[PDB]
Design a protein around this ligand. Structure first.
Ligand SMILES: OC[C@H]1O[C@H](O)[C@@H](O)[C@@H](O)[C@@H]1O
Length: 108
């Protein structure tokens, strides 16, 4: 399962420390993490915010040629890196070798 970095794009705008966004955001990334291998190696989902925070939309794809476990693995690898890559942003795309994730505060 190849998890080497390929490309990234980051919002100039960051999630405020403590922002309620953090929760539905993370909660959504796990839906991506757990379900893409089985929803066809490219999968989108969302999470409505509470307490004034926006809704969160994201998409995730795996290298078709990789396995379901290796698809689920890369995304986990990516989820714990996408915040660092983009310094806690209100939206982002990250491309690694075997898998892709994007998240934003609107629909895309
Ligand atoms: O994909 C993340 C980022 O990419 C570009 O910078 C723009 O489209 C932003 O508005 C978006 O948040």
């Amino acid at each position: 399962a190849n998890t080497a970095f390929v490309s990234s794009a980051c919002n100039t705008q960051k999630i405020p420390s403590g922002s309620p966004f953090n929760r539905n955001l993370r909660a959504m990334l796990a839906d991506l993490r757990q379900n893409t291998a089985f929803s066809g190696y490219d999968y989108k989902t969302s999470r409505a915010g509470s307490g004034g925070a926006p809704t969160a939309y994201g998409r995730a794809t795996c290298k078709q040629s990789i396995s379901q476990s290796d698809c689920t693995a890369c995304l986990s690898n990516l989820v714990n890196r996408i915040f660092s890559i983009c310094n806690n942003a209100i939206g982002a795309r990250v491309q690694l070798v075997d898998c892709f994730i994007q998240y934003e505060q609107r629909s895309f």
